[PDB]
């Protein structure tokens, strides 16, 4: 304070997960990939784990670059 004056003076409903995706055991039952994606899971995606994805198209394969260990 200055001198005294004297007398005079909107959380989203969804969230996208990259590959690999940290998916909870409970997220599996609610997590489902978008319809328009070129990849479709072989087994149901709610099972979890390693899932092989069918390819509808034959375009350039955009992979995920490996990361070196610390």
């Amino acid at each position: 304070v200055s001198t005294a004056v004297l007398s005079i003076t909107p959380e989203p409903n969804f969230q996208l997960l990259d590959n690999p995706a940290r998916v909870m055991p409970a997220q599996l039952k609610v997590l489902t990939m978008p319809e328009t994606c070129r990849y479709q899971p072989f087994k149901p995606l709610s099972i979890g784990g390693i899932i092989i994805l069918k390819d509808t198209s034959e375009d350039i394969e955009e992979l995920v670059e490996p990361v070196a260990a610390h």
Binding site: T3, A4, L6, S7, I8, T9
Partner: protein, 108 residues
Amino acid sequence: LACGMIAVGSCNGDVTSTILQTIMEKSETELKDTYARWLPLGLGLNHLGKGEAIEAILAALEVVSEPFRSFANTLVDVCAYAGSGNVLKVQQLLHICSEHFDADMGAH
């Protein structure tokens, strides 16, 4: 000190010129001596109770070095308002006491 007693509260022009002249002619190390504290009193004595006739004098004290200027500015301003009770001036005085320094810079 002595010239201050002869010309106390008189605002003598002659003594003001020489006291100011001596104050800035002294060295930075010379003003460190505590006997140098007396030169402002002689200037302060001349304006004892005069009041606001110091703004010209206080302007002259601007040119002199620190921390002697802060002491000289405070002293002569005090003798200006001696026996006046001007609370606004006392308001400034308490602000000077408010900020503490961890002696040399706090002589004023």
